[model samples]
Target: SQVVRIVGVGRTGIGKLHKSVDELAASALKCALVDANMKQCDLQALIAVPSLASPQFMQAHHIATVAGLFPTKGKFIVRTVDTGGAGPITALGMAVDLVRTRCAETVAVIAADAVLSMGSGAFAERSNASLRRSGLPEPCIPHGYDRYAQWYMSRYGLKREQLAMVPVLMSKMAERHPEAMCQKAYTLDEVLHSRCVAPVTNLLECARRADGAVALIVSGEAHYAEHFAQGKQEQRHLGGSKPIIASVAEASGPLFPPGSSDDIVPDIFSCRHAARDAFLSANLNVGDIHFFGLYDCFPICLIQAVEAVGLCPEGKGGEFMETAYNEMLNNGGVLDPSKFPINTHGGLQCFGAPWEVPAMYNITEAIAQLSEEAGDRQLTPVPKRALVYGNGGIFSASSVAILISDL
Candidate 1:
């Protein structure tokens, strides 16, 4: 019966970090706890997003014990979410439910991984294993992506340059981000010429594996207000009012169901279903969204996500990218103030993806933009509402959430 709000958000710089998954998760949690003006003792639950490359298999308890997130004097709940990149948003949804149902007054969601530290070979081995276990027709990762790229290009007559523009815009946005791993702005020509990794897709157009962590503190509105009652007169800059979790919905669908042909491009049905339901549950339309944080684990994924979320008509995602790229090119390499902005925090393509943590970045970026505290990366008009989306398991799992500030 209570409203859920994101009271604090914290994240480590995205890149190759030498820290352990436990240390990184703890570090991010420390910052978030401080930001919430609360300590670990005040938390009632700790929800850890499962890591694929962690040395310790029991990631949830490891993170909780290392981070000292358990309540000091009482039994605290600990849960682990298992939906690959979609885990963070799903964890947030679970946290909201926990608070709304009075199971807990406050909860922390954290995700971290030392993928780069573990090396790509090891990461790839684990990733391929997971994909194989999923009963995918293709056990190898990126193979499906290559097929998707080729199909999308032929179906939409998408030129290589049109697809290349995705990474170009992402790199430009990353340039303005202080914590982004990719600080260099890339040109369209550069993206097009980068080493080819798949059919019509270059290395620059793909998300790189990295190591980092992110955390968010969620609390009930009434409890937060009572605990921080002095916050009304204090200039502590919790950034006006907290962003509330208006709605969260997740869906699952078959990538290749029985009797389906293998040559066809798999439909991202999960994203479409989840996005539609999220908007409907929140009583908001696509037009009401001021910012978007789509799960662009790859450039092609971004294109499909844009279309799936109803940003444009189906099959026009390439055109959307092309127009945005051309408009930014003509506008001195800056995103036009009037254009619909997505992934302003560089996204996974440019911001670095550390396993499940990339999805968490979308949530944190949404909170920052909604709070008007994104520093140099802040939007011009300050977005009032943002929609963050994430999908995993080759489009098998997808989740969407609507966030809005109370101001």
Candidate 2:
């Protein structure tokens, strides 16, 4: 029912200073294609993701060259995707469009970011102008990231201790992943008393800056069939293992932008629109989602995503977190992984949050779920449908992708 296929991918978990951005991108790119026996000429387009630290003069063409890509049929096109947390989903959208338009049969997406520090949080704003314009440290820009959490707490009467379930759940999940940056098992007390970054956002509740890169090869259905007939399957791009991207949507938010009206309530963020569109486009709804690779920039981020994606009612994300996490802890509950899986790879709070492509981590893990390659983290009952979401810019930008086991 879908038009695009993610036939290959390359990714390195966070925590590193040895490799440069170009090097990281190149390595990831090589792993996906070369590891799959895919040739340069086989890839018609290249999309390089921007680094967390702005690229110094170099651009996509430079990355293409570094990754050993060149023209075959007149020209080998290369592009740079620079959108914040929404970059990965946006790039995936472009890949689908490109394939649909017959512009490219096979497209390669390269994404990477580096965080020198292994701190509890990854981002710090250099400009408060947006904050000043939006109004307070809790309403508009930088402050708004935490405002949703505050609203959820007041609106739902959820306690901070109940919120502590997020890190404990994710930390436990991280222990299953060898490459996860922060794998230290944490207790409720440890997470609750951890560093508090913002209102209702504790240290373990936030994602730390990490160094990593990812490479994904998206092929159109027509191309996949053609290649599969010729037996192009390899270790990385096993034709049978790649998942189909069912639907994808992009939207921006706050429901109402910052203006003179300080009393305006932001009942919705970007994720709601994007998730709604994706579900509609995929002919599915929250009830149809068997697994999730929800973004985890922060605990509140996870809560927001769950609510926006329709898994939980607005302002009730904390309650859902407790229920799901509690069920997993007790080996039974509605949100239990035995039935519904959320962030099986842990999350940015536990997995490395690469400075640039934290969202791509979600995409990769979702594919892993569909492919049955999730190993110890794999979900029970074998997921047939999953949701991947990316939140950007203080929750102002949201992108969602619906992925399902390949037919």
Candidate 3:
């Protein structure tokens, strides 16, 4: 495949703003176009991530139409990709393939959800109503994530306080980010005292559903170089860096098995396989990557991923996090990105996950770091490569993308 580069990235405010999902998606696309010094008409294709939590029930083509991505005088490709939480990364991989294969000179990827605007509780009611209408049981049983958390603790000989440290670190990082919806830096006590959503899991341990959107512009090397040669460039935050999609891999497996507490647990094969293949495709090791944007729909999800991806030894993710947290505290309460920079944008825990677009946050954040446009969130010594991971459902599906910067 030919080289594909992410030339522009954009994100809208990540909390409740009382705007339609299409409107937010368009706003992000417009910003991305401006950042890339391109126009809407220049986009050869648009790939949208459908909003699962939205009440409008807009499809991918409908989203592109509503977002005004179609050119007035010509026809172009429009696609919508969804794999639940893995939607953004999957869509992005498709866009990269389009550009690399000469199917399109330039492509745009956008994801947005207005779950917060819809009211969390109201959405839940609608969801339950739909389930009932479909002849499914009402008030369906939860996935037992709390049981997973408890199992992790018991298996690793860890405690709840160790898990609490995950969000504590994330909240502090969120406080420093301008677009983070949650700015309050929570303490361990606060997290421990928060309402318990499940056994061994408190309210703060879960991702806060929100309204947000993100857009990225991907172009072929020829197109990018032609623009540069023609002096058709603007003074943008991305500067002259060329951040390329190094590799992408996806895998699927059965959901965490249901069983008695006495049963031996199964491994997260989806995440493990995805990460392994992605690294192999990129010809890089886990240690070679400078930063990470792992999915954190819940703190336990992140911790489990750390081990599944081989970032640490099995059953030692808690210790890895504790070491990172203590280092941040010693560094005046900020993560040293060059060393252990995971979720520098605060992650889904504190950054707010907006349905299908949660993984877009990770992709765009990786691009920003690679291009040296992350502002205060920029890593020292700058990152040359980054790995972004996305998990869909209860680890039922997984996707990994490796991004590299020609700096």
Candidate 4:
């Protein structure tokens, strides 16, 4: 078995691009290389994970060339995965496998997308079609992404004010992120009164499409430590020792049949399965996680993930958020640096959802927090371990990863 260490990472902002997917992909790759403090020539192998929105093979080649790294023949591998929750992290794991087996020593994993940068007309047309196919009512019932929030409100009796609180919390975090797309602050009343895209779910609760990319450089423990020590002598605080791989696990579908009337719905079993597998593989309980970077495509997804991951008892996620936020407010209303921090980088709601790129953001942010280089977003003293979750499809797929500071 070989240990994988995440030595360097980088991400690009959303809404900054206005062109082809290749241009966006190139921008993201540059950001990742800068963050890692390595040049394009340093990578022995390159793996490109493209989003569902673009032509994967074409974009990958364009991105590789633009990043200034051209393989002679077979060193570049470009492949696209299905709309599964664990796609990006799975790509990283594949890189690790190559290094461990001596197939390659250093690998660069890159992913990018441009879903939100399009005009409203294009976005609405695609979004509407997606919702229609989900067996959702077009006129009355909230379909596609909106339905998740609708379901949560109808079942939990959650008010719009309460649901709106999520983005409000996220925006507060974005104030500290220079690269955040939605940096404007919003009040609870403003969010509640925002245009309702679906029943009980205001527009604020859902994510908008944006353009972004994320990248990571993974290598064996020995190589990572050597790089860290070299950086330390130059007074660079960005590098850290190799991070333990711990274990990667995923679960799909429930053991028991899901009831139609259960307050906790299972529209998407991918996340639940991923969380279960990850916890079991790592030999850790849900409570062992000190921080989380669960996907928040919608407020309902966040609530469902919270319950599915055993953060709280089933059917009580709404209550949990209400109580948790109230407690934080009572203690000065800012994110408590000492407590578990969710979406410290503002999450999708505020960070902008670049589809495939968002999952990479979750993984990269967890790495940043663990390395104690999260800067203003860093939690006090840092978390020893972190959980990053992903949602693919319309909550149809889920993936989870457990990252630890120590082996």
Tell me the RMSD of model 3 versus the true structure: 3.3
| Model 1 lDDT per residue over 90-125, tens place | 998999988988888889888899888888678878
Q: How accurate is candidate 4 locally (lDDT)?
A: 0.67
- Which of candidates 2 and 4 reaches a greater lDDT? 2
Q: Arrange candidates by TM-score, highest first: which order?
A: 1, 3, 2, 4
Flag clash pairs in model 4.
Answer: 116-209, 116-210, 251-273, 251-274, 270-398, 271-398
User: Ten consecutive residues with minimal summed lDDT in candidate 2?
Assistant: 118-127
Candidates in order, TM-scores: namely: 0.92, 0.87, 0.89, 0.84
* Candidates' C-alpha lDDT: 0.78, 0.71, 0.76, 0.67
| Displacement of the residue 305 alpha carbon in candidate 3, Å | 2.0
Best by TM-score: 1
Query: Tens digit of lDDT per residue, candidate 4, span 1-407?
Result: 37776765766666657656676666666666665566666676666665545645555556777766775444545444544445677767677677888777667777777776666666556545544434455422234555555556676676656677788777777777777777786667777888877766787877756887777777776875665335543222233324566656554543222223353365535666778877887888777777788788777778777888888877787776777667667777665645547887778888777766687777777777877777788877667778888776566566787777775
In the range 1-407, model 3's lDDT, one tens digit per residue, is 37787777777887888888878888998998877778888788888876756644437677777776555566577787767688778877898888876788888888888888887677667544532422223221122455667777777786787788888878877876888877888877899999877667788887877899988888886787777334443434334244778788888754443545565365544787788988897788887787788998877778877887778987788888889878878898766766667888889889888867888888877777776777788887778888999877656678898888752
Q: lDDT of model 2 at residue 134?
A: 59
For model 1, the run of ten residues with the poorest summed lDDT: 232-241
Give me the runs in candidate 3 sitting further than 4 Å from their true place. 55-58, 71-75, 126-143, 227-242, 255-268, 328-335
Where model 4 places Cα greater than 4 Å from the true spot, the runs are 52-62, 65-68, 73-76, 84-86, 129-132, 137-142, 153-159, 223-229, 233-242, 251-268
Which candidate has the top score in lDDT?
1
